[PDB]
Every structure is written in C-alpha cells, then in structure tokens.
Design a protein around this ligand. Structure first.
Ligand SMILES: N#CCC(=O)Nc1ccc(OC(F)(F)F)cc1
Ligand SMILES: [Cl-]
Ligand SMILES: [Cl-]
Ligand SMILES: [Cl-]
Ligand SMILES: [Cl-]
Ligand SMILES: [Cl-]
Ligand SMILES: [Mg+2]
Length: 348
C-alpha cells in the first residue's frame, strides 16, 4: 500500500498516493470533481476524478460499479482506458471514496471543427479512428450511447480517443430544447420508441462526419419534434417496409400524421464533398436501423482505402454484463466495487 497525503482544494479534501503531484482543479460535474496532476511513476499528465457520493443509493452504487467495470475492460488505442484506481480506505468497513485516474485530455473535436480548416484527408483519418474504436467496443456487446464531438479527444497529430461512455445518466431536462446533448441521437431512441442497440452509435457517427464536412450541425433542432422534422426531411418518411416493423403504437400514431416526403439527394446537400464520403453518409444515415452499415463493414469502405488495415483493427475480450439484471443491496454493490479496486493491475 502506498503512502497517502491530504490537501483541500476548492473546498474538497483530496487524499491521494504520493506519486500524484501538483494537483490543480479543472472542473466538477454532478458525478465528481476532477484535478489535473503529474504522475511521477509513469511520467504522464493525468486527470484524477474523485467520485461524488458513490454509494448514496442503490442506483448510484450500481452506477459506480458499472463505470469501474467498463473502464477496467477498455484496452484499445482509440478508446479511453484506466491508468489507476485507488481508495485511502484500509478495509471494506471504512470504504467510502473512489478515485479514477486517466490520461489528461486536451482539445476535443468541438475545438477542431469550429477553429480549423479540415481537408478531406483530415476527415478520412478522424472518422477512420472513431470506427476503429467502435468496432472494438461493439465486439464486446457494449453500446456507447452518447457519441458527440465533446466526447472525442484529439491531439496535435490528429490522433483520436473515444471517452465518456453513456452510463444511463442523462435526464429529461438535459435533453430539452436547443441543446447539443440531443442533436446526435438516433430518431428511434429520441422519444424511446425502440430499445437501445449498437446501431444508434452509427447514426451518431454519421451526424459527426457531416459536421466535419460542412462545419455546421446537421440536425440542430429546437426541441424533439423540430429535430424529428429536420431528420425526416433529409432521409424521408418511413416506407411500407419499415412501417410494418415499427411496433410502438405511440410512434405509428404520430408518424402517420405527417405528409410523406422522399429521401433527398445527398450530393445536393453536401456540395463539393468527395463522392465516396457522400456514399458512406447515405449508408449511415438510414432511418431503418436494421439497414445501417456496421462499424466493421464501414472500415472496409473505399473512403478509407488510405488507412484500412484488417490486420490492425482488433476486437475486444468478452465482457460479462450479467450484473445489469441482478438485484442487490447497497452494501453488496459496494463490496463488489471494493473487490474491483483492490484487484486492479496497471497497464505495462
Ligand atoms: N421494433 C422496431 C423497429 C423500429 O421501431 N424502428 C424505428 C422506429 C422509429 C423510427 O423513427 C421514426 F419514427 F421513423 F422517425 C425509426 C425506426
Ligand atoms: Cl505513491
Ligand atoms: Cl487511454
Ligand atoms: Cl475511503
Ligand atoms: Cl458536443
Ligand atoms: Cl468480463
Ligand atoms: Mg463528456
């Protein structure tokens, strides 16, 4: 066990191993507070997150366990991984605080799209890396659920990492109105007409790729219904084949109230774009989610011929999510979390 030291920063007590130095606050959401630090064991600049009230309810305790299990599994060049996890507790009986350590991230894709002139070569490389990471994530039967530019870190060499997996933490108010939190969500989950599934992540990638090509949000709706109208104007209203497969009675009733619209010509929407980029966008932004291209299929599309290497696009180890259907007490979720903290083995 390392030696810990305590300090107060922005009215919060931080108790961390001596290896972490020069702590400086960088932000705080509803899930925890974050400091930047220098890790003297590895030489990396890191982000240290102290979870806020991790075991206050069964829902929160299960969410803490879910986040730690996910971060411990992800081992891929284009996905955020876990450098360390620690607690100052010396036993399960005094266990209360959880700290997570990751590589410190600089710019996100938001900064890039609004501040930089992107070539088509830049778009190819950035979208390639998103799909490479997504092939890995989806091969473990994980759904990200919250892909958007602020959850994609990018460095000066145009190298990209996926972060901030959806832990089922977004509320109704967070999704209301003119908000980027909803602009990248697939139509079939925006009003909960379908259960989540991995095809919703490919819809998000299509929205991101369009924005890199044009510099503008693809579907900036002022509310759920305005956004649905923007979507259906581009991709068309549901045809007979898809309508037969829509089981939600709430969806069918409202959809049939709208006048029918054909799919638009994407070459007249994305003026001047590489024809191969237009072709790929048409295969991602499909209303019928059964028919969308998959991440593994998209890596082999000719738009990525410069970068595609099928011997360097790995899949994940199997990921056991059976805990998600399990009903446990707070202290049982807490004991499971403690076991995962003390069994952590750092990367090479
Ligand atoms: N079950 C099943 C399939 C299904 O329900 N798919 C779907 C629903 C709603 C959709 O969105 C919109 F209503 F068409 F806008 C798109 C697809
Ligand atoms: Cl230490
Ligand atoms: Cl990482
Ligand atoms: Cl503790
Ligand atoms: Cl965003
Ligand atoms: Cl597992
Ligand atoms: Mg985020």
């Amino acid at each position: 066990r390392p030696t810990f030291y305590r300090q107060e920063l922005n009215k919060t007590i931080w108790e961390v191993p001596e290896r972490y130095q020069n702590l400086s606050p960088v932000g705080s959401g509803a899930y925890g507070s974050v400091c930047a630090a220098f890790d003297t064991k590895t030489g990396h600049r890191v982000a240290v997150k102290k979870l806020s009230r991790p075991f206050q309810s069964i829902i929160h305790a299960k969410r803490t366990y879910r986040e730690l299990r996910l971060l411990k599994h992800m081992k891929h060049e284009n996905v955020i991984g876990l450098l360390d996890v620690f607690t100052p507790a010396r036993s399960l009986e005094e266990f209360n605080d959880v700290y997570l350590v990751t590589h410190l991230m600089g710019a996100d894709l938001n900064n890039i799209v609004k501040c930089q002139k992107l070539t088509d070569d830049h778009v190819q490389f950035l979208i390639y890396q998103i799909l490479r990471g997504l092939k890995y994530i989806h091969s473990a039967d994980i759904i990200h659920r919250d892909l958007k530019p602020s959850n994609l870190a990018v460095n000066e060499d145009c190298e990209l990492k996926i972060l901030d997996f959806g832990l089922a933490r977004h509320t109704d108010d967070e999704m209301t109105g003119y908000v980027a939190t909803r602009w990248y969500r697939a139509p079939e989950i925006m009003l909960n007409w379908m259960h989540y599934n991995q095809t919703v992540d490919i819809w998000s990638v299509g929205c991101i790729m369009a924005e890199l090509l044009t510099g503008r949000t693809l579907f900036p709706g002022t509310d759920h219904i305005d956004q649905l109208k923007l979507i259906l104007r581009l991709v068309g209203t549901p045809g007979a084949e898809l309508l037969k497969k829509i089981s939600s009675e709430s969806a069918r009733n409202y959809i049939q109230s709208l006048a029918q619209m054909p799919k638009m010509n994407f070459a007249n929407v994305f003026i001047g774009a590489n024809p191969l980029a237009v072709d790929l966008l048409e295969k991602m932004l499909v209303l019928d989610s059964d028919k969308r291209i998959t991440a593994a299929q998209a890596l082999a599309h000719a738009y990525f011929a410069q970068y595609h290497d099928p011997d360097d696009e790995p899949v994940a180890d199997p990921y056991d999510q059976s805990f998600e259907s399990r009903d446990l007490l707070i202290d049982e979720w807490k004991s499971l979390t403690y076991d995962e903290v003390i069994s952590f083995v750092p990367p090479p």
